[PDB]
């Protein structure tokens, strides 16, 4: 029983570490898309403002 408890704790620790690594990778892959979308939004907004100004 004692050996089983020790093994359970070690396995949970390893699983949590792997989960943290996967979460960090997902975070960076999402930040790339966030930057792309931010650039696209800024471009669209400035284009709309300039077009509205030129319309007059």
């Amino acid at each position: 029983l004692l050996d089983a408890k020790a093994s359970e704790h070690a396995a949970r620790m390893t699983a949590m570490k792997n989960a943290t690594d996967n979460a960090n990778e997902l975070i960076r892959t999402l930040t790339l898309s966030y930057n792309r979308a931010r650039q696209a939004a800024i471009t669209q907004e400035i284009t709309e403002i300039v077009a509205g100004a030129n319309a007059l």
Binding site: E45, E48, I49, G52, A53, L56
Partner: peptide, 12 residues
């Protein structure tokens, strides 16, 4: 505002 004839603001 647009019909009055002013330039648009940040978000229209």
């Amino acid at each position: 505002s647009a019909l009055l004839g002013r330039m648009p603001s940040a978000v229209g």
